[PDB]
Structures are given as C-alpha cells and as structure tokens.
C-alpha cells in the first residue's frame, strides 16, 4: 500500500504527505468526499483531511495514540482515496508514531512496608511496578531507589516489555538504631529527555527481643554497718533495656544461687531494684556477703542480665 508515518499530537495543518503525486492522481479526479478514514475496520473521525487544491494530506484533528491504540505496539489508520474519471480506489496506511508525552505513574504515592528486625539479609519484598501509557522506549525502562545502606533494588526483564521489580534487604535492620526508613522509589522511561514518576516507601522496623538487660556495672561494692536497721538501703541498682515496650521492661530479682540465709538477711525490690536490709546483721556471723542480682525482660522469650553485689559488713563496738 501507500504508507506514511505521523507522530501523534501534532497541531492541525501539519503535512503528512503528497497523496496526489504518490498515487499519480490528477487533482480533477479528486473531489469532495473522496477521503474515507477507518480504524480497526470501523469508520473514524477526520483525524486527517485531504486538500483538493494541492493534493496534500495533512493533520486535521488532534491525534492521541494513547486513546486510539492504548498499549498496542502498532497504531495504524486505514485510508481510502476515491478518484473518478475513471473510478479508482487507492488504499493508504498512516502509522501514528508514539511520542513521550506521558510520565511513569505509580498507583499510589505512599507505600508502607513492615519488616521485622530479626529478618535476615537477602530477604525480598514485593513492590508494585509503575505504569506508563506510552509504548516501546517511551514506557517504563528503569527504576532507581533512594540511597540506603539496607535496601537495594533488583530489576529483571520478564516478558517483551515488562520487568520484575524486587526490594532486597542487603544489611540487617536494627530498630534501636532506626525504627523507620524513608525510601523514595523512582521510575524512569527511555524517552529523551527521560520522564520520571516517584512513590514514597516507609519501611517500619518491628521490635524483636534481641537485647538483654544490662547493669551499669558488673560488680558493686558496699560498706554496711552491722547495726544497720532493717529496711536500710544497701544499694540502688540500675538496669536498662533498649528494646520496645514489654521487651524492654525489667523486673529485678535475687539469683537462685543465693543462699537461704542471705534471702532472709537481704531483699530486693522487683520494680526499682533497691537492695535493702531484711534481717539483723552480725559481723561475728558473717564478715561479708555475696548477693547475685539479675534483671529480666517481660518479652516472649525473657532475657536476663546479671551483676554481683559485694557487701562489706563493718564491725560495731
Ligand atoms: C542509679 O541512678 C540514680 C539516678 O540517677 C543514681 O542516683 C544512682 O547513683 C544510680 N545507681 C548507681 C549504682 O549508679
Ligand atoms: C525524571 O526525574 C528523575 C529525578 O527526579 C531522573 O532521575 C530521571 O532520569 C527523570 O529525568
Ligand atoms: C516523588 O518525588 C517526585 C520528585 O520529588 C515528585 O514529583 C512526586 O510527586 C513524588 O513525590
Ligand atoms: Ca498522547
Ligand atoms: Ca505517547
Ligand atoms: Ca513515557
Ligand atoms: Ca537490635
Ligand atoms: Ca529490639
Ligand atoms: Ca530486651
């Protein structure tokens, strides 16, 4: 047939071709109503018009390839040119070229991802692909991710013109270090200049009980007078747990390894961690005491920290 290529979205009056010269048709053989226009085997609006004065085919209306052909790779208008004296029918095909007049667009602007802190590196997360109503090179080609030490993208060709996008955990997460990672995902087409679309991804690091309680010091040394009354404050122990909520909540207790006698002599407060004197003290009975104290989590798997209190009884009278 006769074939022309017209880029979409040209303003009316743009020249397509010289039809009369191409088909060897004298202008006298052309008249009103001599141009028929078809799309997909059905008649269509006057996207094109033929000038009877110079035999030129030109753009008569806005031609939007996206509306016409959507995602189909080829966009073709079928024309019939009708001549008389003698009667002749010439078929013309007009290809509508795609331009990069659309940007890549994600279905949503904001995405939220929940990842447990225990999740090990090399884990992979589904992320939704962007869409670009253009075709070929003008459609989505590459993705890039905002700078992150923890996450990277994997982009793989899948079919003819679509790709698989995967979010990959490259480095371990630590909620105590950072609880929320802000990521921007950018989709880019292959048009020149390239057009972009972005989506925000918020990565929330869920807490695991991966920290055990810890005292400021391993060992405490205290001098206690033997005549110290019961309820006397021996020492205030401070333990801390950086985990979240129940996982960082501590209860103080004396270790089971402590002797029965010491439990009678000494007591510790479960919440505050104040070690106090319970029973009367005798330097003759004992020169020293060794109290083992532990602090425990309220997490699903309770975690513990330990320290030793060394009590020096001071002789009186
Ligand atoms: C525990 O913390 C309190 C509050 O700052 C402080 O007064 C006390 O000395 C601390 N105890 C120890 C053993 O450091
Ligand atoms: C759209 O914009 C992004 C940055 O926002 C570019 O990286 C891309 O190449 C396109 O120009
Ligand atoms: C992602 O970022 C681009 C460029 O900052 C915005 O234009 C877009 O709307 C989204 O916020
Ligand atoms: Ca268009
Ligand atoms: Ca287009
Ligand atoms: Ca595009
Ligand atoms: Ca941690
Ligand atoms: Ca934790
Ligand atoms: Ca903990």
């Amino acid at each position: 047939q006769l074939r022309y290529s017209v880029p979409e979205e040209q303003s009316p009056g743009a020249l397509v071709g010289n039809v009369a010269r191409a088909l060897g048709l004298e202008l006298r053989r052309l008249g009103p109503g001599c141009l028929r226009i078809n799309h997909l085997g059905a008649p269509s609006p006057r996207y094109l018009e033929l000038d009877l004065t110079n035999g030129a085919l030109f753009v008569n209306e806005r031609i939007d390839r996206e509306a016409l052909c959507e995602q189909r790779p080829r966009c073709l208008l079928s024309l019939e040119v009708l001549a008389h004296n003698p009667v002749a029918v010439s078929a013309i095909e007009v290809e509508i070229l795609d331009i990069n007049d659309n940007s890549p667009r994600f279905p949503r602007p904001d995405y939220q991802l929940q990842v447990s802190e225990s999740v090990a590196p090399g884990a992979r997360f589904h992320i939704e692909s962007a869409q670009d109503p253009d075709v070929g090179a003008n459609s989505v080609q590459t993705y890039e991710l905002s700078p992150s030490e923890h996450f990277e993208l994997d982009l793989k060709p899948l079919q003819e013109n679509s790709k698989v996008l995967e979010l990959v955990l490259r480095k371990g997460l630590d909620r105590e270090q950072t609880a929320l990672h802000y990521l921007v995902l950018t989709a880019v087409d292959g048009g020149i200049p390239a057009r972009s679309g972005t989506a925000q991804i918020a990565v929330r690091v869920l807490d695991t009980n991966d920290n055990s309680p810890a005292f400021d010091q391993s060992t405490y040394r205290v001098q206690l007078r033997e005549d110290a009354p019961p309820g006397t404050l021996v020492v205030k122990l401070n333990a801390s747990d950086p985990d979240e909520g129940s996982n960082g909540e501590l209860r103080y207790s004396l270790s089971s390894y402590t002797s029965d006698r010491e439990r009678q002599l000494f007591s510790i407060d479960v919440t505050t961690g104040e070690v106090r004197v319970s029973g009367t003290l005798d330097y003759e009975e004992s020169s020293s005491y060794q109290i083992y104290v532990q602090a425990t989590d309220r997490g699903p798997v309770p975690m513990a920290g330990h320290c030793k209190v060394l009590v020096d009884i001071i002789d009186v009278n």
Side-chain angles (χ1 to χ4, degrees), residues 1-20 22-35 37-39 41-73 75-104 106-159 162-191 193-215 217-256 258-259 262 266-283 286-297 299-307 309-316:
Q1 299 323 355
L2 181 58
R3 270 162 257 198
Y4 292 112
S5 293
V6 176
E8 68 177 309
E9 303 288 353
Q10 273 176 324
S11 276
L15 180 77
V16 176
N18 197 339
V19 166
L23 299 173
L25 302 175
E26 297 182 85
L27 307 171
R28 61 174 184 85
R29 293 182 68 196
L30 302 177
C34 71
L35 179 66
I37 313 201
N38 298 272
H39 184 57
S44 66
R46 298 298 217 125
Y47 294 119
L48 300 179
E49 247 281 290
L50 176 67
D51 185 76
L52 307 178
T53 62
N54 53 31
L57 188 63
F58 58 93
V59 178
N60 185 61
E61 288 173 10
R62 166 191 191 250
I63 308 187
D64 175 31
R65 192 215 59 80
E66 277 71 67
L68 267 184
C69 305
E70 283 145 0
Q71 297 302 126
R72 300 179 284 273
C75 192
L76 306 165
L77 290 177
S78 283
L79 296 196
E80 275 188 12
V81 171
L82 311 147
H84 58 271
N85 295 27
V87 166
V89 183
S90 300
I92 308 187
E93 280 186 27
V94 181
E95 183 186 1
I96 311 297
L97 307 180
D98 174 69
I99 69 179
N100 202 32
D101 56 336
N102 293 271
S103 285
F106 289 95
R108 321 177 149 186
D110 314 315
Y111 295 90
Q112 288 222 354
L113 195 62
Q114 275 177 340
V115 183
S116 162
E117 195 186 356
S118 62
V119 168
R124 307 204 150 210
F125 304 92
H126 159 82
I127 42 174
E128 206 169 12
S129 288
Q131 221 61 234
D132 194 320
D134 295 347
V135 292
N138 291 334
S139 198
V140 178
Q141 300 296 319
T142 61
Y143 290 86
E144 222 44 81
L145 194 72
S146 57
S148 190
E149 334 177 21
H150 300 84
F151 293 100
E152 68 188 344
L153 292 178
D154 193 32
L155 185 65
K156 291 294 166 292
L158 161 69
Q159 49 179 203
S162 312
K163 295 171 190 54
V164 186
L165 193 59
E166 288 174 357
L167 184 65
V168 186
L169 183 74
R170 98 192 291 175
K171 169 182 178 66
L173 298 180
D174 182 13
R175 182 207 71 80
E176 284 81 36
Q177 193 149 355
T178 313
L180 176 63
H181 288 97
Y182 197 107
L183 297 182
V184 171
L185 174 63
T186 299
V188 187
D189 61 34
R195 299 180 60 147
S196 303
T198 56
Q200 320 278 313
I201 297 174
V203 184
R204 303 197 175 274
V205 184
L206 305 180
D207 185 49
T208 72
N209 198 350
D210 60 341
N211 286 270
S212 46
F215 294 93
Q217 220 156 6
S218 167
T219 292
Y220 296 91
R221 194 102 200 184
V222 176
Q223 297 205 297
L224 201 54
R225 281 165 63 83
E226 67 172 325
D227 64 347
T232 301
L233 172 75
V234 180
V235 59
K236 174 61 168 64
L237 301 178
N238 301 325
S240 55
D241 198 282
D243 290 339
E244 174 182 53
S246 176
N247 297 295
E249 265 225 330
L250 309 184
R251 278 180 133 240
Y252 296 87
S253 80
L254 298 180
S255 170
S256 287
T258 53
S259 83
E262 299 194 341
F266 298 106
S267 69
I268 191 173
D269 181 2
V270 183
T271 72
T272 67
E274 289 169 333
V275 178
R276 299 188 182 272
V277 186
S278 281
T280 69
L281 307 177
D282 180 22
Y283 183 86
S286 321
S287 158
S288 297
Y289 295 99
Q290 307 175 359
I291 315 179
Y292 300 98
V293 178
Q294 68 175 326
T296 310
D297 284 343
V301 180
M303 301 279 169
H306 313 80
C307 75
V309 181
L310 295 177
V311 179
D312 284 346
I313 311 286
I314 295 169
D315 196 352
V316 166

